[PDB]
Design a protein around this ligand. Structure first.
Ligand code: ZN
Ligand code: ZN
Lengths: 144, 117, 1035, 134
């Protein structure tokens, strides 16, 4: 409706995307603490997190509550099709489901679009690992 | 301003170029490959829109009402024909630079009316 | 009509019928079949007749034939060739090619019918294979596996797979931008001569950046310039139009700017009109162009002749190469400029380098068609050389000594043998088929490769692009340097094989399309443009009714083959039709008026498919399913399920055109064996897709006749207790790769910490995960000179110089061991002397390749291609799982064994069940492989109910609560926990251990392959230690 | 903000709405109907044109939002044009009392005592918008 006024130093697109990412990241953290409150003292995830032996509070949160927003190059899922992310969506859909908010937990299991967008975000992490495993001794070798 | 187009020579259809009639003190458009000269009606030689302000409704094509993949709504009726369903979309463009305005097109065949809200 | 309770019956029936008809390797087979059916005949028909000169001799090839694969024995007798003999004897499985040649002399003629010109290697189970159409009985008579898919070649006895090669699509205009360039925008067209002889020739059309400071520059701004092939520097675009013979500015601009009432476009072209003002005639423009060649002509007319050849033959060959095509080239060049302008005006978004609608995949067919032209030209070239030396003697000429049949035969063989896709004078094609396990074989036959070079370094090729949906598996890619570059087909992905556009063009010419040459140039403004295979072909003034008519014809499978994609870009006013090969596509259900066209009657007919004649073809022919490619998908609305078609309180979309068949078909082969993959962190699905390829199983049923260099077969594979519906089509039931194991997730004695595993030794004593390893040795007699040869014989110390402390008395008099002999390291398996040019013979006998004690399993003896005696020896050794051995679970949880406890020491339930494997819980929480936990639960329900559990992803009918409720009915704790007792002391354990049956995999990696007994970064650390005497002792 | 606007590079393109170039040989009856009211101030009180002035007019419209946010003003632009070119260019501009933020530019008065003027004026327009540092 053009009722949104831009923040100084940000474009209206940056203003919009900032506001949407705040809402959805707050929801991820609000649901995640609600999950951590649910866990009994017997809970074996909590036993391993609180010991610090393995896992963290976000792993609990993603298993139990919400996997959350999927990102590529730090942004929400790109319109790789013309004005849409997949043929299943209509054009100009900026909503959370369209742009890769996985509102399900790993226990509930992902919907098909969420599964693909979670594969897109997971590919970036696989590429970055391949890059940094190419540099393991690079600066050490040059400095020595 | 708008934009300034082209004139072509009647004799040879090459582009006419502006030059002054220095003795009558009037702008002429004149061919560079033949004697043809034409008196200008416009005085303006050139305009350039750094802000790119133009009515994008001139660039929306009415045939786009046929696209299965755009969202459509009865929530915004057409003025010219009253038809309830309109298709709506963003600029689908660069050079909007910021805005997220929705453009509407009437879905009634052969109406093709376009507006912005 | 089909109701949502019947839907999960219906859609898996139609999927079953697709795989019954197509199978998994159909894009391999159909591509090679098209190569022999069509491309070979065209290559011979398109090759120029020989004009030879005395009398003049004109020679031409008429019609062509192949036999079934046929070997020619060492004496030259033909005999029919079976693939298994080719594997055993190291032969190439190939068919002789014969051609009808007419010899004409000037005038008289004689016909040389069925002249043999060479052998084409045959793709197994293609229509030209001897296995084609055979039944399971016949295949077993031939010692073939009925389940082996074919789709590979046998070259010198080695199975070879052509990995598909991704490339940018030809003939379409792309506009890209580049960061540093002289040019703000560059349009380009990688145009290619309609699959004719000569390669692709790129033209670029570029707009220069305004950043050049200078009065002349600033006064005009951004010039547009063409970059023509075979021309050293850019030509002002208006000169290229003048050289094509359009002289006035208005004639040129009517080809570039379709509405002259668009004054913002008019101002963009003025800097290029002024740049060309001084050239006003075609002859001056042709001189201007021809002056810029690699060797500018000595004279004006020689430059014009060179320029006119370049403009007709070299730029835009897909638009035409004939004497009058220059109006067509002007329209296409003006379109290429017009799209550059629209990109510069921001009116159209730039093209995407990674959008898979802009790609093509080159399969075996296109790869061999390209390659075969190189050999066939060499065939004619060698005839041209040889024949003229007889015609220069006036005597009559005989072709039957000029045709060197080794050209085709050895050129195709060599490139398929090596992967080097050209002369021994593109690489990594034609890989050896991986035979580790059946899923490995299926995934290798469906693998795709990316371009790492020119386009790849400009693209973002490793990212999972949005357009891989339903075409390429999102999970399946290698670790390491190849991440995201090597890819795999989705299970219902099909690659177009291509057809001639002639039937489509003749339809368009009658359905009131207006042709290239006929239009009044203004009329192109309101009309839509029709492109076929990238050729702009005409305009149409009612595109919606045209597009309806086109879709109807394709659905009826009338004039338009179902493989033809047809795309309307409604905002651009372009219709594009592609009959091109190498387009990836997938089948989708048609939706009309929010209803499927698939009705209950189609499912009923498909249910009787074993005795009613109805099949998947009838589903395509009825217009109920449709193939759609990656940029027709730009125009569909896809329902994910018929749930999306139901009425809803807030309506998202009311205009669905298509529906997904089942969303799980986005996965490929190795990802389809993962249970509950929608419950796993996506990196762990990727790791299983690589680990599945390393799981032992039964790789093929006829493994007893195969003499593979290395093979692993499991004693007791089981099908998974928990399975995906797609696993049916992978035939994973029939060739399983793993065992269902009782797994406790427990911290026991600590030997399973990190990723280690504890295994029950008593289960291992009972043959749990036991396997055998087969190693095959080849050896060959040779004849190296007039008095030196290698022969199989038993060496002896009284004659042979090369003798060692190795043991020869296991050999028989033929110099070979027999099967059933127990062998060890430095045992000689094949005694082979060479006579030398006290002693008289050198020893070249072959030893057991490792000290691992095995047993000789088979010894086959034959003759090679050269008729020398040829031996293969297969040795077997049994591999009982050890503490070093690696295991995995289908959820990326790889791990070595850590220790083995007997049943007495394992923890046990009240019922006396000890686990087979104990994994550490610390493997779970940060990896979030929750699918692994759900599998154990569903497997416990399955083993009690006696019913194999459906773990297909995206199934709203299977939820963890429902599995728990079912488990409770069998008297187990609803979450799979159980009271275990410590084996050492018998006390209850305070925690209740999660136990369930889980499908485990034994991986190829075993410690007996690896136990063995200091670079720059190691010296650097020893300097930081200051261990200076160590650092010099170690060097 | 005042210091921010003194550091962040701002060329005239940042603050220009549009260019129009005209043939206007008599400013006393200027071809743009908007300008006859306000331009006459510079002709009741003459400046520069004591010998002659070029008949080719370059008219720029400045963006009042982009001008006001930077707190730029027409005198500060026109004197930077005068500084950046010299007396071989002339600049004429509105008071912000007038409703529209026009600046009018012409080629030298006294050069009348290899690009034709409207070609040179298009070169000048590009050179200002490229490289007139405001
Ligand atoms: Zn003229
Ligand atoms: Zn209307």
């Amino acid at each position: 409706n053009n009722e949104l006024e831009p923040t100084p130093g940000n474009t209206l697109r940056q203003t919009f995307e900032n506001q949407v990412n705040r809402i959805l990241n707050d929801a991820r953290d609000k649901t995640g603490s609600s999950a951590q409150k649910s866990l009994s003292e017997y809970n074996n995830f909590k036993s391993m997190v609180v010991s610090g032996a393995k896992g963290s509070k976000i792993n609990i949160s993603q298993v139990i509550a919400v996997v959350g927003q999927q990102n590529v190059e730090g942004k929400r899922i790109p319109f790789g099709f013309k004005h849409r992310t997949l043929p299943h969506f209509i054009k100009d859909d900026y909503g959370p489901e369209s742009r890769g908010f996985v509102e399900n937990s790993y226990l509930a299991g992902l919907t098909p679009t969420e599964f693909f967008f979670h594969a897109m975000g997971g590919r970036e992490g696989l590429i970055d690992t391949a890059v940094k495993t190419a540099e393991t001794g690079y600066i050490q070798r040059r400095l020595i | 301003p708008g934009f300034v187009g082209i004139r072509f020579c009647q004799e040879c259809n090459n582009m006419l170029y502006p030059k002054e009639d220095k003795e009558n003190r009037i702008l002429l458009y004149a061919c560079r490959n033949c004697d043809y000269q034409q008196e200008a009606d416009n005085s303006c030689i050139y305009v350039n829109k750094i802000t790119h302000e133009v009515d994008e409704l001139t660039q929306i094509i009415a045939d786009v009402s046929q696209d299965p993949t755009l969202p459509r709504t009865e929530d915004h009726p057409c003025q010219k024909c009253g038809h309830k369903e309109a298709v709506f979309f963003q600029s689908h463009s660069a050079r909007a630079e910021d805005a997220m305005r929705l453009y509407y097109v009437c879905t009634a065949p052969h109406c093709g009316h376009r507006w912005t809200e | 009509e089909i109701t949502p309770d019947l839907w999960q019956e219906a859609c898996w029936i139609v999927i079953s019928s697709y795989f019954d008809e197509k199978g998994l390797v159909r894009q391999q087979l159909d591509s090679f079949d098209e190569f022999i059916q069509m491309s070979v005949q065209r290559i011979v028909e398109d090759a120029p007749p020989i004009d030879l000169q005395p009398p003049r001799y004109l020679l031409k090839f008429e019609q062509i034939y192949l036999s079934k694969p046929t070997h020619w024995e060492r004496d030259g007798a033909p005999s029919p060739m079976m693939p298994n003999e080719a594997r055993l004897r190291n032969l190439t499985y190939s068919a002789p090619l014969y051609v009808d040649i007419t010899k004409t002399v000037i005038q008289l003629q004689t016909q040389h019918q069925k002249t043999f010109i060479g052998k084409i290697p045959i793709m197994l189970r293609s229509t030209y294979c001897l296995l084609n159409g055979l039944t399971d009985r016949d295949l077993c008579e031939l010692n073939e596996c009925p389940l082996d898919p074919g789709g590979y070649f046998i070259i010198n006895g080695s199975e070879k797979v052509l990995i598909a090669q991704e490339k940018m699509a030809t003939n379409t205009v792309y506009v890209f931008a580049k960061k540093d360039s002289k040019y703000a925008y560059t349009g380009e067209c990688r145009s290619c001569l309609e699959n004719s002889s000569r390669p692709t020739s790129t033209i670029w059309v570029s707009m220069l950046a305004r950043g050049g400071q200078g009065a002349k520059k600033s006064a005009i701004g951004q010039r547009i310039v063409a970059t023509l092939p075979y021309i050293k520097q850019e030509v002002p675009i208006i000169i290229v139009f003048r050289a094509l013979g359009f002289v006035s500015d208005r004639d040129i601009l009517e080809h570039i700017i379709y509405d002259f009432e668009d004054p913002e476009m008019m101002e963009m072209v003025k800097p290029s009109l002024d740049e060309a003002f001084v050239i006003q005639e075609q002859n001056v423009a042709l001189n201007f162009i021809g002056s810029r060649g690699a060797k500018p002509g000595v004279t004006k007319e020689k430059r014009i002749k060179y320029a006119k050849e370049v403009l007709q033959k070299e730029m835009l060959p897909h638009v035409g190469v004939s004497d009058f095509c220059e109006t067509k080239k002007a329209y296409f060049l003006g379109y290429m400029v017009h799209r550059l302008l629209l990109a510069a005006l921001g009116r159209r978004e730039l093209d995407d380098r990674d959008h898979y609608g802009n790609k093509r995949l080159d399969l075996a067919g296109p790869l061999l068609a390209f390659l075969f032209r190189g050999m066939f030209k060499n065939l004619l070239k060698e005839v041209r050389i040889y024949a003229q030396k007889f015609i220069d003697r006036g005597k009559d000429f005989n072709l039957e000594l000029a045709i060197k049949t080794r050209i085709i035969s050895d050129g195709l063989k060599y490139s398929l043998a090596t992967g080097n896709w050209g002369d021994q004078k593109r690489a990594g094609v034609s890989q050896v088929l991986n035979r580790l396990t059946f899923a490995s074989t299926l995934s290798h036959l469906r693998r795709l490769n990316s371009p790492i070079g020119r386009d790849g370094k400009l693209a973002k090729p490793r990212q999972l692009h949005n357009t891989l949906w339903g075409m390429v598996c999102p999970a399946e890619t290698p670790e390491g340097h190849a991440v995201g570059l090597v890819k795999n087909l989705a299970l219902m992905a099909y690659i177009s094989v291509g057809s001639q556009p002639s039937p489509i063009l003749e339809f368009l010419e009658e359905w009131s399309m207006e042709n290239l040459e006929e239009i009044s140039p203004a009329a192109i403004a309101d009309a839509t443009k029709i492109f076929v295979n990238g050729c702009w072909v005409g305009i149409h003034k009612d595109p919606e009714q045209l597009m309806n008519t086109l879709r109807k014809l394709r659905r009826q499978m009338d004039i338009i083959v179902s493989e033809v994609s047809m795309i309307r870009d409604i905002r651009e006013r372009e219709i594009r039709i592609y009959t091109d090969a190498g387009r990836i596509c997938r089948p989708l259900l048609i939706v009309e008026k929010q209803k499927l066209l698939l009705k209950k009657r189609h499912i009923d007919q498909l249910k009787e498919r074993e005795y009613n004649n109805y099949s998947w073809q009838d589903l395509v022919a009825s217009g109920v399913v449709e193939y759609i490619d990656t940029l027709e998908e730009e125009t569909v609305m896809l329902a994910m399920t018929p749930d999306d078609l139901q009425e809803k309180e807030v309506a998202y979309c009311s205009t669905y055109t298509h529906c997904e068949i089942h969303p799980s078909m986005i996965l490929g082969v190795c990802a389809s064996i993962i249970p509950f993959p929608d419950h796993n962190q996506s990196p762990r699905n990727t790791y299983q897709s690589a680990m599945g390829k390393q799981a032992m199983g039964v790789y093929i049923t006829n493994f007893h006749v195969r003499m593979d260099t290395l093979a692993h077969v499991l004693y007791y594979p089981q099908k998974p207790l928990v399975t995906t519906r797609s696993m049916e089509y992978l035939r994973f039931r029939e060739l399983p790769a793993g065992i269902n194991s009782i797994v406790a997730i427990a911290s026991y004695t600590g030997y399973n910490q990190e990723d280690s595993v504890i295994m029950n030794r008593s289960a291992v004593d009972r043959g749990f995960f036991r396997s055998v390893f087969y190693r095959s040795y080849k050896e060959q007699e040779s004849k190296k000179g007039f008095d030196q040869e290698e022969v199989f014989e038993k060496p002896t110390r009284e004659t042979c110089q090369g003798m060692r402390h190795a043991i020869y008395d296991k050999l028989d008099d033929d110099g070979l061991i027999a099967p059933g002999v127990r062998v060890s390291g430095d045992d000689v398996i094949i005694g082979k002397t060479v006579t030398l040019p006290r002693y008289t013979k050198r020893d070249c006998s072959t030893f057991l390749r490792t000290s691992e004690t095995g047993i000789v399993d088979q010894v086959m003896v034959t003759l090679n291609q050269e008729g020398y005696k040829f031996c293969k020896i297969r040795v077997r050794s049994v591999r009982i799982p050890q503490i070093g051995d690696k295991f995995a679970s289908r959820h990326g949880q790889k791990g070595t064994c850590g220790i083995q406890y007997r049943q007495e020491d394992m923890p046990f339930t009240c019922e006396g069940i000890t686990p087979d494997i104990i994994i550490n819980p610390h493997a779970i929480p940060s990896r979030m492989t929750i699918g692994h936990l759900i599998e154990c639960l569903q497997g416990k329900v399955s083993a009690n109910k006696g019913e194999i559990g459906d773990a297909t992803p995206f199934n709203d009918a299977v939820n963890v609560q429902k599995i728990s409720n079912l488990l409770s009915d069998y008297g187990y704790h609803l979450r799979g926990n159980e009271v275990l007792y410590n084996g050492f002391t018998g006390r209850k354990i305070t925690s209740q251990i999660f136990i369930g049956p889980t499908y485990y995999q034994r991986l190829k990696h075993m410690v007996d392959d690896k136990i063995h007994s200091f670079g720059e970064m190691e010296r650097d650390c020893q300097i930081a230690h200051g261990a200076a005497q160590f650092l010099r002792e170690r060097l | 903000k005042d210091i921010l606007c003194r550091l962040e590079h701002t060329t005239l393109r940042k603050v220009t709405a549009n260019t129009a170039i005209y043939y206007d040989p008599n400013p006393q009856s200027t071809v743009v109907a908007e300008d006859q009211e306000w331009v006459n101030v510079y002709y009741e009180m003459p400046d520069f044109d004591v010998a002659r002035i070029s008949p080719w007019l370059l008219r720029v419209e400045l963006d009042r939002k982009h001008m006001t946010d930077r707190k730029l003003t027409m005198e500060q632009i026109a004197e930077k044009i005068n500084a950046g070119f010299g007396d071989d260019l002339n600049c004429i501009f509105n008071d912000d009392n007038a409703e529209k933020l026009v600046l009018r530019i012409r080629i030298m008065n006294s050069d009348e005592n290899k690009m034709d003027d409207d070609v040179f004026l298009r070169c000048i327009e590009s050179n200002m918008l490229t490289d007139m540092t405001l």
